[PDB]
Amino acid sequence: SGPVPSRARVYTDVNTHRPREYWDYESHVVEWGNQDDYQLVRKLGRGKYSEVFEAINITNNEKVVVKILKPVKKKKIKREIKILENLRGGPNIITLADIVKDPVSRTPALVFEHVNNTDEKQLYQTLTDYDIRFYMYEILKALDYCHSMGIMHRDVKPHNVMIDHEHRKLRLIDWGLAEFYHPGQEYNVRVASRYFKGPELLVDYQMYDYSLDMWSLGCMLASMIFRKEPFFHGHDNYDQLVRIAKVLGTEDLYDYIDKYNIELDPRFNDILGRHSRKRWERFVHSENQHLVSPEALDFLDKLLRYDHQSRLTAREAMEHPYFYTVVKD
Amino acid sequence: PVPSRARVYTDVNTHRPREYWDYESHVVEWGNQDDYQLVRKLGRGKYSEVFEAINITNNEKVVVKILKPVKKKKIKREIKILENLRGGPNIITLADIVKDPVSRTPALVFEHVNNTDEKQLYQTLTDYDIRFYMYEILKALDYCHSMGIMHRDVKPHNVMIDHEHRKLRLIDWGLAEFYHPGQEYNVRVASRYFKGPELLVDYQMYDYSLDMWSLGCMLASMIFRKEPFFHGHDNYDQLVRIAKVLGTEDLYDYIDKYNIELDPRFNDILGRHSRKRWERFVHSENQHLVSPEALDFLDKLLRYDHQSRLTAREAMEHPYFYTVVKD
Amino acid sequence: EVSWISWFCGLRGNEFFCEVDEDYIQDKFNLTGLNEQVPHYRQALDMILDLEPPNQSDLIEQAAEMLYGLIHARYILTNRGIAQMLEKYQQGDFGYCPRVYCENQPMLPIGLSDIPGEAMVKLYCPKCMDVYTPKSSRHHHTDGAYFGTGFPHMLFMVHPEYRPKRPANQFVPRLYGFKIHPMAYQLQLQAASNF
Amino acid sequence: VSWISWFCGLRGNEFFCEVDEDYIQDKFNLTGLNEQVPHYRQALDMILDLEPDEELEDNPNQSDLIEQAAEMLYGLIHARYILTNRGIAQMLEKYQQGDFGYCPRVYCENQPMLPIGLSDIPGEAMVKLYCPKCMDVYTPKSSRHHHTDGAYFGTGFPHMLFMVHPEYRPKRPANQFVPRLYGFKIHPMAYQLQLQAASNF
Ligand SMILES: [Zn+2]
Ligand SMILES: [Zn+2]
């Protein structure tokens, strides 16, 4: 009827070349361990779909993190298990240690490796220029790996990026909303947190790919090198794009919807209005002048784009001038 | 009435310093009660209750006797006597004297003896066993008399037996009293079955001889297998029971010899009875416990006249114990 | 005209219950899996949310009584349910600990089993950390499953500041001023066996 | 009908057993009690049904005081009485009936309990209940017992009762409470951590 189909630019056909058992998570057989091996210590965080507790493994005396999944759907539980197993061992991806359940409650829990929690309230005022360049390269290692395995995170945000500043360790957690990329498939546009949603989700463009994660990665970079959290602050989904239109311009947005034949809903035409494309230098002030550079503003500009095909891929992002300072040493 | 005196150890208490016999002046050295903790209860009934406890300071077993509210005079009395006799042959050793702060109530801590039910021993008891243990009571009574003390309550429950280690102890000196030549004492003493004729006729000037009567009643109870032997209902009937065995004849010769006035209540109930020979109490279930030696020993023990009863030492020399001497 | 939720919690014997927010129940997601535990799930849910509808009326009412209870035990684990129960806990609506040496510590409701019909509601004291049967007989017919097996342990995990310090003094048994040798119960416990 | 019979038949006074008048007429058993209660002579007369001198004809303020005196006296006699083989034999009949109440702890499975005093001094603590199974003391379930002095039952009454009758000691709790959150035990490292957060606070 209308919309033009889109493809991923890298790792397009890695899932169609791999066997059935890999991408089909409904056919995955869960291998349950022993829930008496783990004994709860403290509660660390709450979730919509989960409850997080720090626990102690009583068999080897080791510390473990338990994610008790609140009752959702048997598919979504299988989906997070399968994805976690596939990505296991990969650089900066959370290692799933064990899966256990309670035979009375029937509610399942996920046992992770114990990652040391440093809280955003402390790291924020500590965060230096080299720090950002180091850790941003670590998220990219995690993203380039899961994109290479044929998986998109779909929820990249500072809450799902654990940082251990004392040992300079980074992990990309929370794979509840991750999904396998099949070329040409339409997906749900209600995935990420509102502040980290890409233009394709807001305009109902259902045929997205790995590049969605890259947009979210930008909204994180823009949050740190400008010290404004979040960067695109919208109180609803319609408002969020207006916020994006006030920075990147309305002209490139209309060029985006015309290229793919995406038709906006009635209530969008006036409130979108018209805004020009304002430079990234506008948001810079003294609090973040030491975190910003010509390498940083160029890297952000190739990340935060309306067209998903035009954004930097995870591999092209790593090879940017912004990371020459950190790449090896 | 005509005054009387002890034959052996008459003036032993009068040659001693005052500190020894004067129990009312004795200062009680209090111990620390937190050292002892109860395990299980043993006996009761009298002016006390007996518990087996444990001394947590050295992990040793002890027997804790918890005295009820009686007179402070009586508690001084028992303490001085149990300290004066301490170390003596077959005399119970007092280890500590403790007190509870809140209740004020005192307790006596004894060295633990292994008692075996007079019931689980009564049957096994042999002829030589009685000869052995009677001799061990005589060791205890001769010592206490030489120290100038009469037990005043000699009976089976006041004699503790550890047959396994052939060990005997004379306990319960609550009714024990010092001897002073020619003093009048309370007749309300050694329970009724083990009372001597002098207690029942209200002769107050008795001596160590009283214990030798009570000991006779123990011998009579063992060798004839009759517990108790003289089974009187009350104090008046008790003398009637004694009178039916030893005869009223000698009883009247006893009260004339000391000018003792009988209660006009005895006037007829006592009656007129003759001496019954000791061979009469012997039957087929106690025969293995009776010998010609045994009966002569008993006869010389149980007599109305207290000046004619065998002394503790003289009783030990009897032909009854020739098979027991054995070093 | 008073809502069903406040009517149910208002009833006698149901003093343990807090009023579950309507928007928690209206959010379809929170009630996942409960549609296979209770009979007449459709009519029961309407009867809790005060929406429009034989002894059928009696059976739906029992189902809604069961339905609310299984929502309640899910609700009191959340930060909104905890704050509501914390309010009741701070006024002593649940009762106070029977152990002398806890000194009337306020308690929290707990079920011994999560499966309905296995045990009635019991009481948990945070000081001695043992479980007790409610003193009043009105709470002798409320199901323990409508509170959960891990409500109290979750409340102290969300609010750890509410944990009391351990009993200052112990019960020290004394007869005539003498302590009792634990060797002496070992000896008492046989004599009853041997028996 | 008897005064001792009246007192034990009252509400809240279910824990009390009827003392034999053989025990009370025996002067010896009342050694020391004459200097613990006011109006000792007249208190004992009312207890023993002895008619009170044709006194209190119209002394309603004075009769009331002798009544408190007889109540304190009897209670003090009671505490001594339940230690003797007859006082225990009467309480053991009650203990089997469940007059004293059952243990509030879940894993004692409604164990029949015994009356106990924390202090032997009148006016220091009210009556508590001893459980032979968990060996701990509790506050009586009904408020009708919160007004009965603990000294009227003694500190070592229950302990004496199991020394006399060792066979009446129940076995240890077969089952114990294990906490579970989502079917997970609670690590004890985790209360140590919870107990600070309340201190640190
Ligand atoms: Zn408690
Ligand atoms: Zn109990």
CATH says C91-168 is which class?
mainly beta
* Residue A87 shares a structural domain with residue A130: no
At residue A54, the 3 state secondary structure works out as strand
Partners of residue A96 on adjacent β-strands: A112
Structure tokens at B120: 């689980």
Residues A99/A32, Cβ–Cβ less than 8 Å: yes
Residues A187/A179, Cβ–Cβ less than 8 Å: yes
Q: Which residue numbers of C belong to the known binding site for Zn(2+)?
A: 97, 102, 125, 128
Whether residues B102 and C177 touch (CB distance < 8 A) is answered with yes
Structure tokens at C144: 């323990």
Distance between CA atoms of D18 and D6, rounded to whole angstroms?
Answer: 9
* Residue A266 shares a structural domain with residue A185: yes
Q: Are strands A96-101 and A50-57 parallel, antiparallel or unpaired?
A: unpaired
Residues A40/A66, Cβ–Cβ less than 8 Å: yes
Label residue B152 left, alpha or beta by phi (over 0 means left) and psi (-120 to 50 means alpha): left
Report chain A residues whose CB lies below 8 A from the CB of C32: 71-73
At residue D23, the 3 state secondary structure works out as helix
Residues A117/A307, Cβ–Cβ less than 8 Å: no
Q: Are strands A108-113 and A151-152 parallel, antiparallel or unpaired?
A: unpaired
Domain edge (last residue) among B112, B145, B168? B112
Report chain D residues whose CB lies below 8 A from the CB of B41: 160, 163-164
How are strands ordered across the β-sheet holding D114-116? D114-116, D128-130, D137-138
Residues B207/B6, Cβ–Cβ less than 8 Å: yes
The ligand that comes nearest to the alpha carbon of residue C126 is 1
Distance between CA atoms of B109 and B74, rounded to whole angstroms?
Answer: 17
Kindly calculate the radius of gyration of chain A based on its CA atoms and give it in whole angstroms.
21
CATH says D97-174 is which class?
mainly beta
**DSSP states of A122-149 as a string?**
HHTTT--HHHHHHHHHHHHHHHHHHHHT
| C-alpha D114: how far from chain center | 7
Instruction: List the single residue in C177, C181, C188 with the smallest CB-CB distance to B54.
Output: C181
Structure tokens at B206: 């008795």
Whether residues A41 and D181 touch (CB distance < 8 A) is answered with no
How far lies B300's CA from each of A50, B272, B297, B306, B318, in Å? Answer: 99, 23, 5, 11, 10
**Interface size, chain A vs chain C, as Cβ–Cβ contacts under 8 Å:** 18
Residues C54/C73, Cβ–Cβ less than 8 Å: no
Give the technique used to solve this structure: X-ray
Q: Could you give the number of structural domains in chain B? A: 2
Partners of residue D169 on adjacent β-strands: none
Residues B142/B168, Cβ–Cβ less than 8 Å: no
Residues in CB range of B45: below 8 A, 6 or more apart: none
Distance between CA atoms of A322 and A137, rounded to whole angstroms?
Answer: 10
Q: Are strands C179-180 and B36-43 parallel, antiparallel or unpaired?
A: parallel
Kindly state whether D165 is in contact with chain C, defined as any CB-CB distance less than 8 angstroms. no
C-beta neighbour count of D17 within 10 angstroms: 22
Is residue A52 marked as binding?
A: yes
At residue A98, the 3 state secondary structure works out as strand
Nearest to A200 by CA among A313, A312, A309, A314: A309
Residues A153/A159, Cβ–Cβ less than 8 Å: no
Distance between CA atoms of C42 and C28, rounded to whole angstroms?
Answer: 12
Distance between CA atoms of C121 and C133, rounded to whole angstroms?
Answer: 8
Distance between CA atoms of C137 and C121, rounded to whole angstroms?
Answer: 11
Burial class (CB in 10 A: 0-12, 13-18, 19+), B260: middle
Distance between CA atoms of A14 and D191, rounded to whole angstroms?
Answer: 49
Touching status, chains B and A (3+ beta-carbon pairs under 8 Å): no
Residues B154/B218, Cβ–Cβ less than 8 Å: yes
Residues C166/C105, Cβ–Cβ less than 8 Å: no
Nearest to B60 by CA among B30, B37, B42: B37
Chain position carrying tokens 């602050």: A233
Distance between CA atoms of B86 and B78, rounded to whole angstroms?
Answer: 12
Residues in CB range of A37: below 8 A, 6 or more apart: A57, A58, A59, A98, A100
Instruction: List the single residue in A46, A53, A73 with the smallest CB-CB distance to C79.
Output: A46
Chain position carrying tokens 């929502």: C71
Kindly state whether D175 is in contact with chain C, defined as any CB-CB distance less than 8 angstroms. no
CATH of D1-96, one of 1.10.1820.10, 3.30.420.40, 3.30.470.10, 1.20.140.10: 1.10.1820.10
Chain C residue closest in CA terms to B65: C176
Read off φ and ψ for residue D6, nearest 5 degrees: -70, -45
Best D155, D163, D165 member to test B by mutation, with max B CBs in 10 Å, is: D163
Structure tokens at A110: 């996920």
Whether residues C175 and D160 touch (CB distance < 8 A) is answered with yes
CA dihedral C73, C79, C82, C86 (to 10 degrees): -170
* Residue B93 shares a structural domain with residue B155: no
Q: Determine the distance separating the centroid of ligand 1 and the alpha carbon of C100, expressed in angstroms.
A: 8
Distance between CA atoms of B59 and B36, rounded to whole angstroms?
Answer: 9
Q: Which residues 76-115 of B are in CB contact (within 8 Å) with C?
A: 99-103, 105, 107
Q: Are strands B177-178 and A50-57 parallel, antiparallel or unpaired?
A: unpaired
Distance between CA atoms of C150 and C155, rounded to whole angstroms?
Answer: 9
Distance between CA atoms of D10 and A291, rounded to whole angstroms?
Answer: 85
Taken as a whole, chain D contains a residue count of 201
Read off φ and ψ for residue D24, nearest 5 degrees: -85, -35
Distance between CA atoms of C81 and C18, rounded to whole angstroms?
Answer: 8
Q: Are strands B36-43 and B48-55 parallel, antiparallel or unpaired?
A: antiparallel
Whether residues C178 and B102 touch (CB distance < 8 A) is answered with no
- SS3 percent helix, strand, coil of chain B, rounded to 5, is 40, 15, 45
Looking at chain B, list the stretches that DSSP marks H as alpha helix, in order from N- to C-terminal side.
18-21, 72-84, 119-122, 127-146, 197-200, 209-223, 235-246, 248-257, 266-269, 292-299, 312-316
Chain position carrying tokens 């233009």: A199
Q: Strands of D57-168 (E only): list them.
A: 114-116, 128-130, 137-138
Instruction: List the single residue in B40, B44, B102 with the smallest CB-CB distance to D120.
Output: B102
Distance between CA atoms of B126 and B133, rounded to whole angstroms?
Answer: 11
The ligand that comes nearest to the alpha carbon of residue C164 is 1
Burial class (CB in 10 A: 0-12, 13-18, 19+), B74: middle
At residue A243, the 3 state secondary structure works out as helix
Distance between CA atoms of C113 and C151, rounded to whole angstroms?
Answer: 12
Distance between CA atoms of B97 and B255, rounded to whole angstroms?
Answer: 44
Structure tokens at B243: 């009178």
**DSSP states of A154-170 as a string?**
S---GGGEEEETTTTEE
How far lies C132's CA from each of B189, C124, D134, in Å? Answer: 57, 6, 13
Helix or strand (DSSP H, E) at B53:
strand B48-55
Helix or strand (DSSP H, E) at A171:
strand A169-172
Exposure of B250 in the CB half-sphere (CA atoms within 13 A): 17
Distance between CA atoms of C185 and B150, rounded to whole angstroms?
Answer: 40
Structure tokens at A49: 């779909």
Burial class (CB in 10 A: 0-12, 13-18, 19+), A125: exposed
Whether residues D85 and B51 touch (CB distance < 8 A) is answered with no
Q: Determine the distance separating the centroid of ligand 1 and the alpha carbon of C134, expressed in angstroms.
A: 13
Residues A66/A53, Cβ–Cβ less than 8 Å: yes
Nearest to A197 by CA among A175, A181, A179, A220: A220
C-beta neighbour count of A12 within 10 angstroms: 16
Distance between CA atoms of B67 and B108, rounded to whole angstroms?
Answer: 8
* Residue B119 shares a structural domain with residue B223: yes
- SS3 percent helix, strand, coil of chain D, rounded to 5, is 45, 5, 45
Helix or strand (DSSP H, E) at A93:
none
For residue B33, what are the domain limits?
Answer: 22-112
Amino acid at residue number B227: E
Report chain B residues whose CB lies below 8 A from the CB of D85: 44
Residues B215/B144, Cβ–Cβ less than 8 Å: no
* Residue A159 shares a structural domain with residue A61: no
* Residue B126 shares a structural domain with residue B46: no
Looking at B63-208, list the stretches that DSSP marks H as alpha helix, in order from N- to C-terminal side.
72-84, 119-122, 127-146, 197-200
How far lies B256's CA from each of B1, B117, B200, B304, in Å? Answer: 10, 43, 15, 12
Report chain C residues whose CB lies below 8 A from the CB of D193: 160
Residues in CB range of C64: below 8 A, 6 or more apart: C4, C43, C44, C45, C47, C48
Read off φ and ψ for residue C31, nearest 5 degrees: -105, 20
- Active-site positions of B read 153
C-beta neighbour count of D174 within 10 angstroms: 7
Residues B118/B166, Cβ–Cβ less than 8 Å: no
Residues B315/B140, Cβ–Cβ less than 8 Å: no
Residue A231 sits in a domain of what CATH number? 1.10.510.10
Task: Verify cis geometry, omega within 30 degrees of 0, for the bond prior to C167.
Answer: no
**DSSP states of C61-97 as a string?**
HHHHHHHHHHHHHHHTTSHHHHHHHHHHHTTTSS-B-
Residues A159/A119, Cβ–Cβ less than 8 Å: no
Is residue A46 marked as binding?
A: yes
Distance between CA atoms of B95 and B220, rounded to whole angstroms?
Answer: 34
Exposure of B197 in the CB half-sphere (CA atoms within 13 A): 31
The ligand that comes nearest to the alpha carbon of residue D172 is 2
Chain position carrying tokens 């001799």: B135
Read off φ and ψ for residue C61, nearest 5 degrees: -70, -35
* Residue A93 shares a structural domain with residue A156: no
Label residue A208 left, alpha or beta by phi (over 0 means left) and psi (-120 to 50 means alpha): beta
C-beta neighbour count of B71 within 10 angstroms: 10
Amino acid at residue number C22: E
* Residue A184 shares a structural domain with residue A327: yes
Helix or strand (DSSP H, E) at A8:
none
Report chain D residues whose CB lies below 8 A from the CB of A39: 184-187
* Residue B153 shares a structural domain with residue B44: no
Structure tokens at B159: 């004699």
DSSP state of A4: P
Looking at B85-174, list the stretches that DSSP marks H as alpha helix, in order from N- to C-terminal side.
119-122, 127-146
* Residue B314 shares a structural domain with residue B234: yes
Structure tokens at B25: 């002046």
Burial readout A42-61 (b: 16 or more C-beta within 10 A, e: otherwise): bbeeeeebbbbbbbbbeeee
DSSP state of D173: P
Instruction: List the single residue in D32, D160, D164 with the smallest CB-CB distance to B69.
Output: D32
Domain assignments of chain D as residue spans, ordered by start: 1-96, 97-174
How far lies D93's CA from each of A282, D84, D133, in Å? Answer: 92, 14, 18
At residue A119, the 3 state secondary structure works out as coil
How far lies A76's CA from each of A23, A67, B268, D107, in Å? Answer: 13, 14, 111, 41
Distance between CA atoms of D113 and D106, rounded to whole angstroms?
Answer: 14
Whether residues D31 and B51 touch (CB distance < 8 A) is answered with no
Best A39, A53, A110 member to test D by mutation, with max D CBs in 10 Å, is: A39
Chain D residue closest in CA terms to A54: D190
Residues in CB range of A304: below 8 A, 6 or more apart: A215, A218, A219, A222, A248, A311
How far is C80 from chain B, CA to nearest CA, in Å? 53
| C-alpha B187: how far from chain center | 14
Distance between CA atoms of C168 and C163, rounded to whole angstroms?
Answer: 14
Nearest to A55 by CA among A7, A98, A3, A118: A98
Residues C142/C120, Cβ–Cβ less than 8 Å: yes
Distance between CA atoms of D155 and C172, rounded to whole angstroms?
Answer: 10
C-beta neighbour count of A269 within 10 angstroms: 9
Nearest to A303 by CA among A127, A117, A140: A140
Domain edge (last residue) among B79, B112, B145? B112
Residues A41/D189, Cβ–Cβ less than 8 Å: yes
Chain D residue closest in CA terms to A55: D187
Distance between CA atoms of A11 and B188, rounded to whole angstroms?
Answer: 115
How far lies A138's CA from each of A166, A219, A228, A317, in Å? Answer: 15, 16, 22, 12
Q: Determine the distance separating the centroid of ligand 2 and the alpha carbon of A99, expressed in angstroms.
A: 39
Residue A79 sits in a domain of what CATH number? 3.30.200.20
Which CATH number is associated with domain C1-90? Answer: 1.10.1820.10
* Residue A177 shares a structural domain with residue A75: no
Whether residues B44 and D166 touch (CB distance < 8 A) is answered with no
